[PDB]
C-alpha cells in the first residue's frame, strides 16, 4: 500500500508487520530499508501497490517519486517513473503523483509506476491542459491572513505583534532579519501554529534547512502539515535538492490554485550552499561570494508571488546577521531589495530577556493598505505615530507590557480607546 501509510508509525509496527510478512530480521536494517523490504514482500503477494510522491526529474528524462516523510530525498522507496509518463502528461517537478507501482525485478533499481491515478489531488486531465507557474501574472497581497490565535497565550502576542507591526497575507514575500540567539525558532513555531489554527484552509508547509536534528523532531511533530527538512547531515547538494523540490511543489500547488506558506530558516545557509555549488567565474565579490552565486537563490526567493487566476505562494525566509564576516551580510543586502516584506528582530533586546524583541521601526510592508481594512489602517498609522518618538527600549517595553495586559488585538484597539 501507501508508503506514508507505513511511515506515519514508528519502526516497531514496521518490524511486526514484516514479521507478519515472514522475512529476514527487519530491525537490523534501517526503518526505511524495512519499508523497502516490506513493500517488496507485499508486491510478492501478487498485488499492485499504490504509491505516491512528488516528482524529481534528472537529465535522463525519467523521474523519481520522492516521499514526504523521507524529507524529499533519495531513498530505496523512491518510485521510478518511466519517461513515457513525461511524454504523455509531462509531469513537472513537484507534481504530487499517486498511482499503481510494481516491484523491481532483479538487476533493476526500485519500484516502477505503471499508471497515474491522481495528479495533485485532481484528475489527470487537468495536468496536461493547465496554465504554468512562471507563466502566471504576479500581484500583491489582496487577502489578509490574520495571525492572532484568540485565547490570549503568552506567545500568542508573538503573532499579535506581527498583526500590529506589519500584516502578512497571501502571495507576500517576507524576510526575517535576526542575529543568532534572538528567538526565531519559537517565533516561527507559534506563527505556524497560529496559521494552522486560525486559517486551516491554507496549506502549511514549514521548511527547515541545516539545523539541529532535535529541532527537526520538535518541528515535525508540533505543527499542522508536512514538515520536510534537511539538517547539516546532508551536504549542499541535498540542501539545494530539497529546496528546489519544495519550491517546485509549491509552484505546482499554486498552479492548481492553492495557497502555500513556506516558512524557511535560514536563507543565509541556503545562500552559502548555493555559493558552494556554483561554477567559478574566475572572480570573487566582496565577502567571498561568486558572481553568479546569487542567480538561483534569487530565483528561489522570487518564486513567491500572488496570482490573478488562483492560489498564492507566501515565503517567510529568515535572514541571519551578526555573523562576523561580510558574505552573509552581503546576502542580506541582496535580499532586502527583492522581497517586498521585511520583518526585523532584535538581539540587543533579547539578551535583556525581553521577548519578543521585534524591530518595530524597520519593520514594514509594501502596499500594506491591501492587507488591512480602512479604519484599522488609520488606527495602525496613529499607533505607529505614537510608537515612533519614544526610544527603542521605551517602545519595546510599552509593546510587551500593554499587549500582555491585553488578550486580543481588537480588544487592544478598544482598550487604547
Amino acid at each position: 500500500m501507501n508508503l506514508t501509510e507505513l511511515k506515519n508509525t514508528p519502526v516497531s509496527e514496521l518490524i511486526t508487520l514484516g514479521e507478519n510478512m515472514g522475512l529476514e530480521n527487519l530491525a537490523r536494517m534501517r526503518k526505511q530499508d524495512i519499508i523497502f523490504a516490506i513493500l517488496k514482500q507485499h508486491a510478492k503477494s501478487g498485488e499492485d501497490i499504490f504509491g505516491d510522491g512528488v516528482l524529481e526529474i534528472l537529465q535522463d528524462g525519467f523521474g523519481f517519486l520522492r516521499s514526504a516523510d523521507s524529507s524529499y530525498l533519495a531513498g530505496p522507496d523512491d518510485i521510478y517513473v518511466s519517461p513515457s509518463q513525461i511524454r504523455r502528461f509531462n509531469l513537472r517537478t513537484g507534481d504530487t503523483i499517486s498511482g499503481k507501482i510494481r516491484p523491481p525485478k532483479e538487476g533493476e533499481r526500485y519500484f516502477a509506476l505503471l499508471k497515474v491515478n491522481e495528479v495533485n489531488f485532481d484528475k489527470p486531465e487537468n495536468a496536461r491542459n493547465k496554465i504554468l507557474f512562471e507563466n502566471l501574472t504576479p500581484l500583491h497581497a489582496n487577502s489578509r491572513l490574520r495571525m492572532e490565535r484568540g485565547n490570549g497565550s503568552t506567545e500568542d502576542l508573538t503573532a499579535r505583534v506581527l498583526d500590529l507591526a506589519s500584516p502578512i497575507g497571501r502571495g507576500q514575500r517576507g524576510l526575517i532579519v535576526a542575529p543568532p540567539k534572538a528567538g526565531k525558532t519559537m517565533l516561527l513555531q507559534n506563527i505556524a501554529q497560529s496559521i494552522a489554527y486560525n486559517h486551516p484552509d491554507c496549506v502549511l508547509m514549514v521548511l527547515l534547512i541545516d539545523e539541529r536534528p532535535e529541532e527537526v523532531t520538535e518541528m515535525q511533530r508540533l505543527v499542522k502539515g508536512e514538515v520536510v527538512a534537511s539538517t547539516f547531515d546532508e551536504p549542499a547538494s541535498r540542501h539545494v535538492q530539497v529546496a528546489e523540490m519544495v519550491i517546485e511543489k509549491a509552484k505546482r500547488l499554486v498552479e492548481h490554485k492553492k495557497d502555500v506558506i513556506i516558512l524557511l530558516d535560514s536563507i543565509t545557509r541556503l545562500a552559502r550552499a548555493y555559493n558552494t555549488v556554483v561554477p567559478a567565474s574566475g572572480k570573487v565579490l566582496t565577502g567571498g561570494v561568486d558572481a553568479n552565486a546569487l542567480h538561483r537563490p534569487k530565483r528561489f526567493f522570487g518564486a513567491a508571488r500572488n496570482v490573478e487566476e488562483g492560489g498564492s505562494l507566501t515565503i517567510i525566509a529568515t535572514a541571519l546577521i551578526d555573523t562576523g564576516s561580510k558574505m552573509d551580510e552581503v546576502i542580506y543586502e541582496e535580499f532586502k531589495g527583492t522581497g517586498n516584506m521585511e520583518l526585523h528582530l532584535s538581539r540587543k533586546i533579547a539578551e535583556k530577556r525581553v521577548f519578543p524583541a521585534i524591530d518595530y521601526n524597520r519593520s514594514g510592508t509594501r502596499k500594506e493598505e491591501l492587507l488591512t481594512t480602512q479604519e484599522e489602517l488609520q488606527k495602525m498609522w496613529i499607533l505607529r505615530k505614537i510608537i515612533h518618538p519614544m526610544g527603542e527600549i521605551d517602545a519595546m517595553e510599552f509593546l510587551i507590557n500593554k499587549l500582555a495586559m491585553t488578550k486580543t488585538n481588537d480588544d487592544f484597539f478598544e482598550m487604547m480607546k
Binding site: 519517461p83 511524454r87 499508471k115 486531465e125
Partner: protein, 49 residues
C-alpha cells in the same frame, strides 16, 4: 504522439490502459537494451599486463 483520450470508461479506458502499458513496456525494454549495449561498447577491454 497522442495515446491520450478518455470516454466510455467501462471498456475504452481498460483497453487504452492496456495499450498504454504495452507501449511503456516496449519503450522501456528498448531503452534498456539501448543502455546495455551502450555500456557494453563503452566498457574498455583488457589488453595485456
Amino acid at each position: 504522439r497522442w495515446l491520450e483520450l478518455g470516454l466510455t470508461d467501462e471498456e475504452k479506458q481498460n483497453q487504452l490502459e492496456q495499450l498504454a502499458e504495452q507501449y511503456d513496456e516496449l519503450k522501456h525494454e528498448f531503452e534498456k537494451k539501448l543502455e546495455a549495449k551502450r555500456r557494453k561498447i563503452t566498457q574498455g577491454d583488457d589488453l595485456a599486463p
